[PDB]
Symmetry: C3
Subunit: 376 residues, 3 copies
């Protein structure tokens, strides 16, 4: 059966019989007719809905945490994948791989109707980037989120607030290793690492970047991928954050992200070298400082540079202390938030120090990234 067909021009002045189907040969689509409307009602070609992703509640993430090691895709989720419509009319279990503490996972809706997680961010085991579509993901944290204000535990589990989907995600360039804070903005779960170029800013069990072990110099700002900044100036950390489409936190962002930590408590010991891992001779284990949202070492471990200025000022003269990128006049301090290991009861979700110029560097100052929450 071949249908009556013509060009778009020919259709413009054609009115088919009621419930007649013609073919627009310019478009290669069907045109439905009502016996009244000239040009009829052309139908959409599938390619035009490619990548469609529809949720029942667009103001929440597409997935529900159902247990420490389990999660589900929500009822009402419709997904375009490999030319097919794949949907879920009930909360449907996500098929899990073996989960390892401190690893990010990607969630795929597959063209066979399954939904599955995997550590591979291209395609899940047994599928291709064609048969499996990445719709979101999560972080499998080394410990629980804080239930109150005494930090969390060390039972590896899905951090519910790290659940993201393609329409409910960090505005950062990459969504991995972030958690949603009060539904308002995303925070890096872990402090900035030295190897942020290959690891991203937020990674479990890596060397923390500070004054003594400066982060790798940004390849977007003349770095080569091997060189590190010569110190831990605010300037350098802010630059690394920008590389990744993130910011250093505001005061309001810091207090929100760090809530849940054990207040007025510090790591103790002599150092905090590694993310998600006890400090050197620490009197408090790392988990003492997990926030409500799953931000690891949220306070009392390393100060973070903040994105705020004020407090004590530098000299009222042109001082060339910017790494050779100009001079500053009456430069106010750049905020430091959280406290560090040496700071006993001074540390906490609101610990703030405003007596260090942005050109300052030390072994107990690093950084944490934040970014905007995107709902699409």
């Amino acid at each position: 059966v071949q249908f009556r067909g013509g060009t778009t021009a020919q259709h413009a002045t054609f009115t088919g019989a009621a419930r007649e189907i013609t073919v627009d040969t310019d478009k290669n689509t069907v045109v439905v007719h009502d016996g009244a409307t000239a040009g009829g009602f052309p139908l959409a070609r599938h390619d035009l809905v490619k990548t469609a992703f529809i949720k029942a509640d667009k103001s929440a993430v597409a997935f529900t945490r159902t247990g420490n090691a389990t999660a589900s895709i929500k009822a009402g989720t419709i997904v375009e994948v490999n030319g097919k419509l794949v949907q879920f009319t009930a909360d449907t279990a996500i098929t899990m791989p073996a989960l390892t503490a401190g690893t990010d996972y990607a969630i795929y809706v597959c063209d066979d109707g399954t939904v599955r997680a995997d550590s591979n961010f291209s395609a899940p085991t047994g599928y291709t980037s064609t048969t499996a579509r990445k719709v979101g993901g999560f972080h499998y944290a080394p410990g629980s989120n804080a239930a109150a204000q005494a930090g969390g535990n060390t039972t590896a589990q899905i951090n519910e607030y790290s659940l993201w989907d393609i329409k409910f995600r960090p505005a950062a360039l990459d969504p991995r290793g972030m958690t949603l804070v009060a539904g308002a903005f995303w925070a890096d779960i872990y402090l900035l690492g030295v190897n942020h170029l290959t690891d991203g800013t937020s990674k479990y069990n890596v060397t923390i970047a500070d004054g003594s072990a400066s982060p790798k110099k940004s390849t977007k700002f003349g770095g080569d991928g091997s060189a590190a900044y010569s110190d831990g100036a605010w300037y350098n950390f802010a630059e690394v954050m920008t590389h990744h489409g993130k910011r250093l936190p505001n005061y309001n962002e810091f207090q929100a992200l760090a809530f849940g930590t054990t207040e007025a408590t510090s790591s103790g010991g002599t150092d905090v070298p590694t993310t998600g891992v006890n400090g050197t001779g620490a009197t408090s284990a790392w988990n003492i400082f997990t926030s409500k949202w799953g931000v690891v070492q949220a306070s009392g471990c390393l100060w973070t540079w903040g994105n705020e200025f004020g407090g004590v000022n530098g000299a009222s003269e042109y001082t060339a202390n910017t790494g050779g990128r100009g001079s500053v006049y009456a430069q106010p301090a750049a905020a430091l938030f959280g406290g560090s290991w040496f700071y006993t009861s001074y540390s906490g979700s609101r610990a703030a120090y405003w007596n260090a110029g942005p050109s300052n560097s030390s072994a107990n100052i690093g950084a944490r990234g934040v970014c905007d929450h995107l709902i699409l």
Copy 2:
């Protein structure tokens, strides 16, 4: 009539006759043929366009204010609802319910082709959440926006700048009670209430939150829904704003949002207890302070905490004044904007005070929320 049909695999190597229609039984969709392209041209299933919402001008809101109590949906608006395509090829009147001063309304496009407003945010009277689709809304304000710089009147009317649609809206968690300022960002029409958990941050005719009547403690930050913060510290107000996905305003945001108010004028009297209502013994009625954008009590009523730091500093020693969440060192002031009732000619769209630490509290300091503008 049953058409030739096969699986997706079978179609991959099949080329139908020109203007032949086959059925892909794996997809359950039509495949159009051109007698040349192997696999033909599969058509989109309706479920894949579910929630589609298309506007002629994506850089403006979907509705036009046509009068004090009337509004229209714009020509060129196409809406998916209950499986149907519903569209408007001309500016079409929105069917209104009875409107009450200081109430938010939701706009629904219904599957019978009508568009209507309602105070119910689930479904409008006579419809269900299935037959009626919420596409946006507005605030019916207690008075007009400022025509110049002398505030507004007390004639209840639609605030044109409070018009929002699902693709032109506050980034806040909930869009209600906000107004779009210079097309740049959204501002809470009303000052933060004590009962922001059940009312949202911006509600007409409610008790204002300040140092003496602190807001309810955020349920996202260990609050139970009954307890209030023990004082009106910047810390507490910033926290409440975050709860709702909002911020305290910047200096640039404040001057923009408050423009239109009567400058160098204060409420007078002894207090401002209630939003959108005269202050206690006020010498100026509330409407004296409506901004160009419809921000109520924009200036001269209560100071708002700002999201900016600087000015006079606290001691250069570790001071534990954060509500038990750490210590601050050389803590600069948190900005206060707008002036309050006692401040005569000092109040205005640029009134700014930088001599109060974020741990300060008083009966004339509250907060106003802002957030980013979202165009999708």
Copy 3:
């Protein structure tokens, strides 16, 4: 051929034969049947996919710069235009018009399958707003982006970082004359002009706005389109930026946007009157100050007001210096970034001055706009 058809109600309880097609007369669409599913599988009408725009990589711009005067649309780009599906399965050359230094261009995907640039932002030469769809654009800069930290050249060329598409763009009200900085945020290529109302904030070869030649007063804030602000206060510049949905830069934004400029170098001479053009008696040509991202006169030409406060404070008394919009108490300085022509080695990507109150005005202080990066 007229098909069996009925209303949506009638379909709800109808199960057609496998691979039968019926017509829903309420919807005017086809319903496919499987001989099992009551109501069958209704297909999408084309109008519901109107404006669809699909890219292979949603995290990058839709176009590639292929040379100084050439560019391509990327493989995998699917575009809805004038009822047709138009797509590109390989990187496809964009048809160029004659290009002029310092001009913005719009990219259209046309219903004949072509993709072309044009200086007209409504429709390209030989097409209409119906037959041609605007999907993005770019800036054809007066010179190259900085390869290192010695600025750029004067060979007119496409600035690769100024490439934007409808789903990868500034959050600003208008996308023109902006460049994407480290993939993180957008910066105005040029300093704010006096005639920003008709030119936008960022335009080549126009009079720069400063203390002596204040910008036009914003029509969104009581301006008439002819009047200028009486001086170059921070207040006025911040206001102009808001008009356009932009901000003055943060410190972190400024250092990012200006990287690539010749550091510790100033324009010299006695003035910088015009964007993208040598200063008056300048010892360094304008191109000495082009950033890595193509920000023109990024440093050492005119200070920009920043969106940050701190440093030296005004008096601890209520000072009415806000242009008659209230009083300020202990007002900290508003940041100035970049240096200017007189400032020799003090200028650079990190040059910052914190000793000028927001009410200050001078011939060497202007502004540059930034905004958020939008990925949709």
